[PDB]
Structure 1
């Protein structure tokens, strides 16, 4: 099945998911000089105060922190979005090396990692219905460079030992996702897709311009994660990013 190596990687995915070569694929390169400031963008609203995490999960591709989304608690609204999108989970993609790992790039510059906070459009009643919709999801993308530690990330780093291999999960309640955000909400936005199979074209992308900084030793611990399940040969979870895809006519709008 799909993965990130030579034989099952992003270059192979189109075979099971033809949409891989579609008209609104993610990620993209953000050409900062070509993105237009857009005055009809409302201010962005990230309300994460009442966010309730349930658990952390290694799914053999990344690790997912999953949230209770049965009630309106953690929502993204405003910016390019119409109505209310509920936070359901977040995850990261990262590299074997500090100079690679993000999915989006900024004038071709790759960051050490990229975090994705995933929200679904509440007009559609459940997450399952929204992903079948062109405006079904909003993903908040955040870059990670290597520098000083992100204190608000270390509870995630420490729990990773518990979820080394595919299929492992741990209780992970009361994680507050606000500690992962940078100061600025300046952003680029574009219409796009899931960056993993099924690569569905249901995503409004909102990518923060300001990177967060994490320590060398924090990213180093991401890299100790395994793609494999318990008691299979050891394949380190690194370089789980999809490269930039063709822009194809789309415009990237800047909020600033």
Structure 2
């Protein structure tokens, strides 16, 4: 099946998922000088005060912290979005080294990791239906650089021991995603796709300009996870990022000057 190895990685995905070579694939390189300030972009509205996390899962390629999305409890609105998008889960993409790991790049610069908070458009009823729509998802991406520790990320780091391998999950209630946000909500936005198969072109990407800092110990813990299932040869979960794709006929807009 697909993965991030030499034999099933990003360069192989198009065989099972031809949309991999589509017109609006993600991630992309964000050329800061070419992105255009768009005064008509409304401020982003992140309302996570009532967020209800439920569980954390190692799915074989990343770990997802899942939320109750059966009601508007944690939503993203405003910015380039029309309507309300509900948070369903968040996960990360990281590298084997601090010099790589992010999916989006800024003027070709790669960050140590990238957090994706996935939200779906409530006008579509459920996530499964939303991904079949061009404006079905809104994914908030936040770059991670190594430096000082991120206090709000520690609870996630500490539970990873319990979901070391593919298929393992653990209760993960009362986690506050507001603790993973940088100070500024300035962002770049463009129409794109999921960065993992099925690579559906249903995402409005909102990538924050300001990265958050995590400690070397925190990211090191990410790199101890396994792509493999328990009782299988150990393959460390590292470099689970897709490289930048052709921008093609798209313009990246900036919410700031």
Q: TM-score, normalised by structure 1?
A: 1.00
Deviations along 1:47-105, one digit per CA (max 9) or x if unpaired, are 00000000000000000000000011100000000010000000000000000000000
Q: Tell me the SS of whatever aligns to 1:14.
A: helix
CA distance in 1, matches of 2:20, 2:128: 20
Q: Tell me the SS of whatever aligns to 1:145.
A: strand
Following TM superposition, by how much is the alpha carbon of 1:29 offset from its aligned partner in structure 2, in angstroms?
A: 0.1
CA distance in 2, matches of 1:181, 1:53: 16
CA distance in 1, matches of 2:125, 2:144: 33
Following TM superposition, by how much is the alpha carbon of 1:125 offset from its aligned partner in structure 2, in angstroms?
A: 0.8
Following TM superposition, by how much is the alpha carbon of 1:194 offset from its aligned partner in structure 2, in angstroms?
A: 0.2
Following TM superposition, by how much is the alpha carbon of 1:40 offset from its aligned partner in structure 2, in angstroms?
A: 1.2
The residue aligned with 1:216 is: 216
CA distance in 2, matches of 1:164, 1:33: 41
Q: Tell me the SS of whatever aligns to 2:231.
A: coil
Q: Tell me the SS of whatever aligns to 1:115.
A: strand
CA distance in 1, matches of 2:72, 2:164: 32
CA distance in 1, matches of 2:90, 2:21: 25
Deviations along 1:117-154, one digit per CA (max 9) or x if unpaired, are 00000001111111110000000000000000000000
Following TM superposition, by how much is the alpha carbon of 1:106 offset from its aligned partner in structure 2, in angstroms?
A: 0.1
Following TM superposition, by how much is the alpha carbon of 1:249 offset from its aligned partner in structure 2, in angstroms?
A: 1.6
> Which runs of structure 1 show a deviation greater than 6 angstroms over 4 or more consecutive aligned residues?
none
Deviations along 1:142-194, one digit per CA (max 9) or x if unpaired, are 00000000000000000000000000000000000000000000000000000
CA distance in 2, matches of 1:209, 1:15: 34
CA distance in 1, matches of 2:100, 2:126: 35
Q: Tell me the SS of whatever aligns to 1:123.
A: helix
User: What is the aligned length?
Assistant: 256
CA distance in 2, matches of 1:43, 1:32: 19
Q: Tell me the SS of whatever aligns to 1:20.
A: helix
CA distance in 2, matches of 1:214, 1:130: 32
CA distance in 2, matches of 1:36, 1:44: 17
CA distance in 2, matches of 1:223, 1:25: 27
CA distance in 2, matches of 1:163, 1:83: 35
Which consecutive residues of structure 1, in runs of 5 or more, have no partner in the other structure?
A: none
CA distance in 1, matches of 2:44, 2:182: 14
